[PDB]
């Protein structure tokens, strides 16, 4: 790090223990934040941790859907974010509109809604789900039919291996950050015959086809602990590859390709020590959008133990 980065990083370590905040960040945070925090971890990882934690207050390093699951769990502590618009652009292609018209097309089908999803929008779940749940979830709720959005992709994955029905909505709810080209896996074979390849079910499924292992960025991170590959090639966005390379220093982690989350990349430095000075923004929610959105995602956990 630089000496202006340096000044900036032992601001807000000394203002997150004077203030009683703890520091939760995803794994697609730059490296730099991840530092900071006092956790780092994939969606389901950072649910949990929200159950545990003792703090009253939390600055979450993150996109918007995550840091108000965060405060669903915890309505009476406070929440802050550097910027309220980093979000998922999954997240304006599914509406309580089309929800409710998908419930009348297919009455008798609960609805699983993936967390990159607004609050709103999991008001009206049946359950919740993340991309390492989402299989076990669905595999053990009663229908053969079931209905699932956003995204397609971890949809299709997760009828896969389910074998349900799984109807996606909207129409291609997809992320464009896991929409690499299978090529770049012939390629990596060719250049590393030995790695092993890890992609994330928001993956193609051409890409999820020929890769080693399919798992969210939290399962991604624990293979390396069974598997003793020298190398692995990395299906998921860049900021990934940090957390990897930090737990494992003595293997290699080569970016499938280079894939970027703007949104992620919305926290810095500065706007998380200035949320630190000003305990702002707020991450506040309508009371009855967390009384009926906590049901689905206390679902989640009864469907896993
Ligand atoms: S990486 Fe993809 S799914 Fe995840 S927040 Fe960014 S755009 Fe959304
Ligand atoms: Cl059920
Ligand atoms: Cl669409
Ligand atoms: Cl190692
Ligand atoms: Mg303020």
């Known amino acids: 790090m630089h000496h202006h980065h340096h000044h900036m990083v032992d601001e807000i370590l000394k203002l997150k223990k004077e203030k009683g905040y703890i520091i939760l960040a995803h794994n697609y945070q730059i490296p730099e934040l991840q530092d900071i925090a006092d956790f780092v971890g994939d969606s389901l990882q950072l649910a949990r941790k929200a159950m545990e934690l003792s703090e009253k207050k939390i600055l979450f390093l993150g996109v918007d859907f995550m840091a108000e699951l965060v405060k669903i769990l915890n309505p009476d502590k406070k929440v802050?974010?550097?910027?309220?618009?980093?979000?998922?652009?999954?997240?304006?292609?599914?509406?309580?509109?089309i929800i409710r018209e998908y419930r009348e097309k297919?009455?008798?089908?609960?609805?699983?809604?993936?967390?990159?999803?607004?609050?709103?929008?999991?008001?009206?779940?049946?359950?919740?789900?993340?991309?390492?749940?989402?299989?076990?979830?669905?595999?053990?709720?009663?229908?053969?039919?079931?209905?699932?959005?956003?995204?397609?992709?971890?949809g299709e994955y997760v009828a896969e291996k389910t074998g349900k029905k799984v109807i996606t909505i909207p129409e291609n709810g997809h992320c464009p950050v896991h929409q690499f080209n299978a090529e770049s896996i012939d390629a990596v074979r060719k250049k590393y015959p030995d790695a092993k390849v890890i992609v994330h079910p928001e993956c193609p499924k051409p890409v999820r086809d020929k890769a080693d292992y399919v798992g969210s960025t939290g399962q991604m991170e624990k293979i390396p602990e069974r598997d003793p590959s020298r190398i692995f090639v990395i299906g998921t966005e860049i900021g990934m590859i940090h957390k990897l390379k930090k737990k494992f220093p003595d293997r290699e982690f080569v970016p499938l390709e280079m894939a970027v989350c703007v949104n992620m990349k919305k926290n810095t430095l500065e706007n998380t020590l200035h949320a630190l000075q000003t305990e702002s923004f707020e991450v506040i929610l309508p009371k009855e959008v967390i009384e009926k959105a906590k049901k689905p995602i206390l679902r989640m956990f009864e469907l896993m133990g």
């Open 106 to 154: 297919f009455p008798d089908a609960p609805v699983v809604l993936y967390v990159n999803s607004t609050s709103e929008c999991k008001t009206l779940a049946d359950v919740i789900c993340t991309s390492a749940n989402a299989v076990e979830v669905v595999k053990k709720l009663d229908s053969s039919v079931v209905i699932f959005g956003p995204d397609r992709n971890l």
């Open 80 to 97: 802050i974010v550097p910027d309220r618009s980093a979000t998922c652009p999954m997240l304006n292609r599914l509406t309580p509109e």
